Amino acid sequence: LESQYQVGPLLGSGGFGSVYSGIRVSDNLPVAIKHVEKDRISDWGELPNTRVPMEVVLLKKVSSGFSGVIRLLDWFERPDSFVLILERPEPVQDLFDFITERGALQEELARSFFWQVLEAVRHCHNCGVLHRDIKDENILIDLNRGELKLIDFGSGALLKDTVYTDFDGTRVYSPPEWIRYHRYHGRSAAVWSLGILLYDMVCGDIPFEHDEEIIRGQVFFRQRVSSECQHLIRWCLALRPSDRPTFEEIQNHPWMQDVLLPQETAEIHLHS
Ligand SMILES: N#Cc1ccnc2[nH]c(-c3ccc(N4CCNCC4)cc3)cc12
């Protein structure tokens, strides 16, 4: 409803729709207002009571309590579109633009960011939600608190233990078993994409541009990267899904030890 919110600038637009900066007028809470056209939504969930975008289903499942997931505050239906009201940190920067600006990240900052992503994805998985499009574009930095927040569930699914045969996320982040066989399981495809994400943070760019590089799965480092970080990246990018580490094995890996707290991260690395 437009009496409830005051619309500000367009923050961005893409396959997720159009996202505007906004202010809830009853208390001047900062929000992000996202518009998605009905005809451009492919997978529809439905809530326990009416037919909705799958994205709202998944967001409600993960929006209870605190976490590093942008939380859904409200939504509205319009004749041709859905409108989502999402929280907005201030100041905030997409991790993609952040990497564009700074290049390859110091391993200390990548570790903290990567740790927070793992914690956020784990939370999603405990709520029964598979994101399916983990990448730097879908991660926001709360610059003051040094906290990362996951966004854009419009390609996700309910988590399940059987095989997925559909995928509509980012291809250069998708695993080799999707490219060759159009089949994957939720968590090991998620680990693969986290492998891509970690590489992207410590090298400033994704390791694979084409299907054959994905399928060959050979990782070449164009920046200096510690042997432990290299070993973790290659473990997540194991060609056989069952050779990939569990979430727990990632967080017990030697490269993941002694993480900074998020406010520490901001004070040291984000000028807080
Ligand atoms: N604040 C906030 C917020 C809350 C929920 N979803 C978002 N997407 C975005 C967002 C999405 C995309 C972009 N960009 C702008 C830079 N080019 C890539 C697309 C910038 C911001 C922000 C938010």
Residues 165 and 143 in one domain: yes
Q: Is 12 annotated as a binding residue?
A: yes
Evaluate whether 237 touches 195 at the Cβ level (below 8 Å): yes
Residues 74 and 101 in one domain: no
Output the CA 12–ligand 1 centroid distance in Å.
Answer: 6
In sequence order, which residues have a C-beta less than 8 Å from that of residue 41 and are 6 or more positions away?
Answer: 53, 54, 55, 82, 154
Residues 71 and 152 in one domain: no
CA distance linking residue 56 with residue 90, whole number of Å = 23
Output the CA 11–ligand 1 centroid distance in Å.
Answer: 6
Q: How many residues does the chain have?
A: 272
Domain end among 44, 75, 90:
90
Residues 128 and 62 in one domain: no
Q: Kindly list the catalytic residues.
A: 133
Residues 18 and 136 in one domain: no
CA distance linking residue 63 with residue 252, whole number of Å = 27
CATH number of the CATH domain containing 253: 1.10.510.10
Closest listed residue to residue 88, CA positions, set 194, 8, 169? 8
State residue 254 phi and psi, 5-degree precision.
Answer: -55, -30
Residues 39 and 146 in one domain: no
Domain end among 56, 75, 90:
90
What residues are in contact with ligand 1 under a 6 Å CB criterion? Answer: 11-12, 19, 32, 70, 86, 88, 92, 94, 97, 140, 151
Report which DSSP code applies to 137: G
CA distance linking residue 208 with residue 216, whole number of Å = 10
Residues 163 and 177 in one domain: yes
The approach used to solve this structure was X-ray
Give the DSSP H/E element, type plus range, for residue 99: helix 95-102
Q: Is 14 annotated as a binding residue?
A: yes
Q: Which residue has the tokens 């495809």?
A: 189
Residues 29 and 115 in one domain: no
Evaluate whether 116 touches 62 at the Cβ level (below 8 Å): no
Q: Is 219 annotated as a binding residue?
A: no
Residues 84 and 129 in one domain: no
Residues 65 and 179 in one domain: no
Output the CA 68–ligand 1 centroid distance in Å.
Answer: 15
CATH number of the CATH domain containing 70: 3.30.200.20
The one-letter code for the residue type at 101 is E
Residues 186 and 223 in one domain: yes
Count of domains observed in the chain: 2
Domain end among 90, 112, 135:
90
In sequence order, which residues have a C-beta less than 8 Å from that of residue 256 and are 6 or more positions away?
Answer: 111, 114, 115, 232, 250
Q: What does this entry list as its resolution, in Å?
A: 2.3
> Domain span at residue 31?
1-90
Mutate to test the pocket of ligand 1, among 139, 151, 152 (most ligand atoms within 8 A of CB): 151
Shortest-distance atom of ligand 1 to CA 30: 1
CA dihedral 200, 102, 87, 35 (to 10 degrees): -70
Residues 84 and 98 in one domain: no
